[PDB]
């Protein structure tokens, strides 16, 4: 240890040539004992190295080589000191990098090397990426962008751009974000790109600009719109005059899409509906429409003839915003008719398909008949060309659009019926062509679903026989036909369809249904409905069961302008057919079971067959055909149990030896299928009964083997910036399989408590809780973090609460887990979003023992710690939003704040009083979330109203906070946002609480002339 200090003291001097020997010794003295002693030392050697660096630089080609070798020494030290773990102090290193890069006295290659080291050693480390303060981010951005604007053109410029990119991402993902005043910086760069032809690094600069606009669009919406109106013409000029490379074109397209999203949230056509309109924006829209039309007729826009999907989406959005220089659907019709080559016809078909699908109201009624006239002329070619699928998709979209309209005239209806019947006649021939069998059937469905064509006898013949093998589109068309048609007798047909569905080659060659995945409970419903006396009624009854990016910013925009407001808004079965179906299913199951081999057959086929059997049984049980108790004694249940027992052999074999790597895929597929089999919802559906049967199928040995495999796996030992520790790229195949098995076990435990099963849910739950033991779990491991988050999200349940000791076991390591990731914003947000699920079990107070208060304190202290850290401006708006969601859940759990009190600094705060504080936040999205969720303070939400005084006090406090938000006051956007927050709070109070209606109305009347609320906005809200 003393040797290093002596060597550093010697190196502090200035020798003529012995300093080279000292440097060689420094490079060569790094050994394992020295590294072990350095653990805390690195700061001192680093500052001594800085002394040497400044002394050496104090004293052309030779100087350039000296700079190169000194940079090599610096990077060698940096990679050696952090090779095992990030230990070097980061702020001083960032200061060193800034000092070396800002001055132009150093050589260009030396600055490039320093920037490369900053990019590859600092921004690539998660700890350094997360610990950097906002001021350092801003000064780094300024320094590294001022360098970019310099006229010195070299190879490092592109690299510099990359730096900015990374920095921008960091400043938008770890702090409050860059100020709006930085935007002009970006603008300057664009202006340079207007005259500079090389355009070395515009892609990275524009990607950083896109990230900045995405972050800055939530506020300052009008500012962003003005910036777009200022910038976009230059981008169009660059697109016209540049080389038209790939990455730059894609980034420009993405930026145009973002601008259109901001100007027209969710396709707001007019200003009164939410759009922001300007003459410059309209001219830009027309110019960009012309540019995209010109770009479509190009080889590079697409052997392949389809256009890239992003271009089609942008084109459809522009057309919707432009359509009423007519520029209407007649342009599309003319392009469809005039174009002869299929290369010039597919893009317009794609554009029409997207326009119809996204905006059905765009196409007027009067254009329905002519359009179908044109499309019917493109399809009937006897050979199926490369343009046939696109024509079929366009026809399907047109049919689905027509099905949604009810203001059609009788003559129009007759003409449409004639055209639909004709094109049905053309499209029916050639159905045997498998090459387009996915599209054809779908079109047929669109015809059948809308009842646009009467089904003939020959259509039913298509399903029977060997004309077409079963497939997902074919089965979907079949169930659509069964829903809105009556099967002709021609028993000979229903049994034929049943045999076709259940066909298996007699003596190997597994049936197509067992090979291809189908949507859950689709084959079983068809099979059951076939056997019933009234197939159409049974299918309708089955279908009648009740249901169990930048989009959110667009929804926030719509909410701010008050254009969207989420609030204030006897069967009989043929015995012979049933026996035939049972015989066919039993025969298929037996043929699968006896042919089974330990290696030859696949694992998921057995599970698919078992799922089919239990689904058929559950579909029978949903109606009155079969009884619950004697469905267990049926031979089908025994065969399904045997199939599952045979399937468990693979699990046992993998348990015997885990080192095998080729069995992971099949096990993962089987676990995913089993997870899909089970359901946790309880609404008296065939899915619930099928899930119960499947749960009863599983034996205790399989569950114990799965738990043992999970324990063994758990115990077993380009991108822009740092990688998120929760990223899936850190997970191997074994980790993914372990996560799938853990999810399956969690669902089994959660759903097993309702029913009775062979295995014991308590033992499996105890084994699961053994995984998060303090001695075993290390939060620093990504797999353990994923395991803990999955357990937190899955284990708690509302219908059947867990024992409070299990809740304590779940909550025990949470304090440490939050302690490790205090710095990371993304991990904190994920942790909050996952922990908000425990409040359902925490709120129970029937067994209010000491364990209940212990668990409640354990959770509330963590929530209060997060709130206290938030109050000190320590977390970004995402963590604040997650905290708001958690507090809303807490308010739902305990309306009266009997136990939900946050303790911090020796003081206590009720959750209700804390919640109203978020109405004066600095971010619009958090304020809107709080204002929209404020209704929890006036209703039980478990719908009985709260006492009078509580409601009065809550309304007064919320109104006062909303007033104070405005009271603390180019910046029209802030004023507009605060006014919208106030009006939204008043509207929510009016909609939810009938007691405070008069008070809310009087407050609105006062604020009309006191706060300067816009009369038209409040008028619209009051009208609604």
């Amino acid at each position: 240890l003393n040797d290093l200090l002596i060597c550093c003291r010697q190196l502090e001097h200035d020798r003529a040539t012995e300093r080279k020997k000292e440097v060689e010794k420094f490079k060569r003295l790094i050994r394992d004992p020295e590294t072990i002693k350095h653990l805390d030392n690195w700061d001192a050697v680093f500052r001594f190295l800085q002394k040497y660096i400044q002394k050496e630089t104090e004293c052309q080609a030779s100087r350039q080589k000296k700079m190169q070798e000194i940079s090599s020494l610096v990077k060698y030290f940096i990679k050696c000191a952090n090779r095992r773990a990030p230990r070097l102090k980061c702020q001083e290193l960032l200061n060193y990098i800034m000092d070396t890069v800002k001055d132009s006295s150093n050589g260009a290659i030396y600055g490039a090397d320093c920037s490369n080291i900053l990019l590859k050693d600092i921004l690539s480390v998660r700890k350094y990426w997360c610990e950097i303060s906002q001021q350092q981010w801003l000064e780094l951005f300024s320094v590294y962008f001022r360098l970019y604007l310099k006229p010195s053109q070299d190879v490092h410029r592109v690299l510099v751009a990359r730096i900015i990119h990374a920095v921008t991402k960091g400043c938008c993902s770890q702090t409050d974000g860059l100020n709006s005043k930085f935007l002009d910086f970006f603008s300057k760069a664009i202006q340079c790109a207007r005259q500079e032809k090389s355009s070395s690094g515009l892609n990275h600069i524009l990607a950083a600009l896109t990230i900045f606009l995405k972050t800055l669009a939530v506020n300052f919406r009008i500012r962003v719109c003005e910036l777009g109106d200022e910038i976009l013409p230059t981008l169009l000029y660059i697109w016209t005059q540049h080389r038209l490379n790939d990455s730059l074109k894609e980034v420009i397209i993405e930026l145009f899409q973002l601008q259109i999203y901001i100007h027209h949230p969710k396709g707001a056509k007019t200003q009164e509906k939410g759009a922001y309109e300007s003459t410059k924006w309209r001219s830009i829209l027309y110019n960009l429409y012309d540019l995209l039309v010109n770009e479509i007729s190009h080889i590079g826009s697409r052997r392949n003839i389809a256009v890239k999907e992003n271009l089609i989406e942008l084109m459809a959005d522009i057309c919707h915003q432009v359509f009423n220089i007519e520029l209407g659907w007649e342009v599309i019709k003319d392009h469809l008719q005039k174009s002869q080559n299929d290369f010039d016809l597919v893009p317009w078909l794609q554009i029409a398909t997207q326009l119809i699908s996204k905006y059905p109201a765009s196409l007027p009624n009067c254009e329905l008949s002519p359009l179908l006239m044109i499309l019917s002329q493109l399809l009937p070619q006897q050979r199926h060309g490369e343009r046939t699928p696109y024509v079929l998709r366009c026809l399907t979209e047109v049919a689905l659009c027509q099905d949604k309209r009810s203001n059609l005239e009788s003559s129009q209806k007759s003409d449409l019926l004639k055209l639909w019947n004709k094109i049905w006649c053309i499209t029916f021939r050639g159905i045997s062509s498998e090459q387009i069998q996915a599209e054809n059937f779908g079109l047929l469905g669109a015809i059948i679903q809308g009842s646009l064509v009467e089904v003939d006898r020959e259509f039913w013949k298509l399903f029977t026989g060997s004309a077409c093998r079963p497939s997902c589109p074919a089965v979907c068309c079949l169930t659509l036909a069964l829903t809105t048609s009556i099967v002709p007798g021609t028993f000979s047909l229903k049994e034929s369809i049943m045999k076709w569905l259940l066909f298996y080659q007699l003596e190997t060659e597994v049936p197509p249904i067992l090979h291809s995945n189908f949507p859950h409970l689709v084959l079983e419903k068809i099979l059951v409905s076939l056997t019933m006396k009234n197939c159409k009624a049974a299918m309708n009854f089955f279908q009648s069961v009740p249901e169990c990016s930048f989009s959110e910013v667009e929804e926030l925009f719509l909410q701010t302008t008050f254009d969207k407001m989420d609030f204030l808004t006897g069967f009989s079965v043929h015995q012979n057919l049933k026996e035939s179906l049972d015989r066919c299913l039993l025969g298929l199951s037996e043929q699968l079971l006896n042919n089974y081999s330990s290696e030859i057959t696949n694992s998921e086929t057995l599970v698919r067959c078992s799922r089919l059997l239990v689904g058929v049984l559950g579909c029978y049980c949903y109606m009155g055909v079969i009884a619950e108790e004697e469905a267990y004694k049926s031979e089908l249940f025994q065969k399904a149990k045997s199939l599952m027992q045979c399937a468990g052999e693979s699990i046992t074999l993998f348990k015997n030896k885990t080192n095998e790597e080729f069995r992971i895929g099949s096990l993962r597929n089987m676990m995913q299928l089993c997870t899909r089999c089970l359901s946790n919802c309880t609404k008296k559906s065939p899915n619930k009964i099928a899930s119960g049967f499947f749960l009863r199928l599983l034996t205790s040995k399989l569950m114990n083997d799965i738990a043992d495999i999970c324990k063994s796996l758990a115990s077993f030992i380009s991108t822009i910036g740092a990688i998120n520790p929760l990223a899936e790229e850190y997970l191997s195949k074994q980790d993914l399989l372990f996560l799938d098995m853990l999810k399956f076990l969690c669902l089994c435990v959660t759903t097993a408590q309702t029913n009775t099963v062979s295995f014991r849910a308590a033992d499996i739950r105890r084994k699961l809780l053994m995984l998060i033991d303090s001695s075993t779990l290390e939060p620093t491991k990504s797999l353990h973090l994923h395991m803990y988050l999955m357990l937190l999200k899955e284990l708690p349940g509302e219908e059947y609460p867990l024992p409070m000791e299990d809740v304590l076991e779940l909550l025990k390591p949470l304090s440490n887990v939050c302690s490790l990731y205090r710095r990371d914003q993304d991990v904190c947000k994920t942790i909050l979003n996952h922990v908000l699920h425990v409040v359902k079990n925490l709120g129970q107070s029937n067994m209010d023992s000491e364990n209940t208060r212990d668990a409640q304190g354990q959770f509330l202290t963590v929530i209060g710690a997060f709130w206290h850290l938030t109050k000190e401006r320590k977390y970004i708006f995402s963590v604040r939003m997650a905290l708001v969601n958690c507090l809303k859940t807490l308010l739902e759990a305990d309306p009266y704040s009997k136990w939900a009190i946050l303790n911090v600094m020796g003081k206590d705060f009720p959750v209700n009083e804390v919640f109203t504080q978020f109405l004066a936040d600095n971010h619009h999205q958090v304020r809107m979330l709080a204002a929209e969720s404020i209704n929890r303070l006036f209703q039980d939400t478990k719908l009985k109203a709260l006492p009078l005084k509580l409601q009065q006090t809550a309304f007064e406090n919320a109104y006062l906070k909303a007033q104070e938000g405005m009271r603390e006051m180019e910046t029209l956007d802030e004023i507009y946002n605060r006014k919208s927050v106030l009006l939204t709070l008043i509207a929510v109070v009016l909609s939810c609480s009938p007691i405070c209606e008069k008070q809310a109305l009087f407050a609105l009347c006062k604020s009309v002339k006191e706060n300067g609320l816009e009369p038209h906005l409040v008028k619209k809200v009051l009208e609604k």
Binding site: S819, R822, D854, G857, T861, V862, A865, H868, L869, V904
Partner: peptide
Amino acid sequence: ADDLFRYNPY
């Protein structure tokens, strides 16, 4: 600095 996260019954 980090003692806030820990739960203290006493």
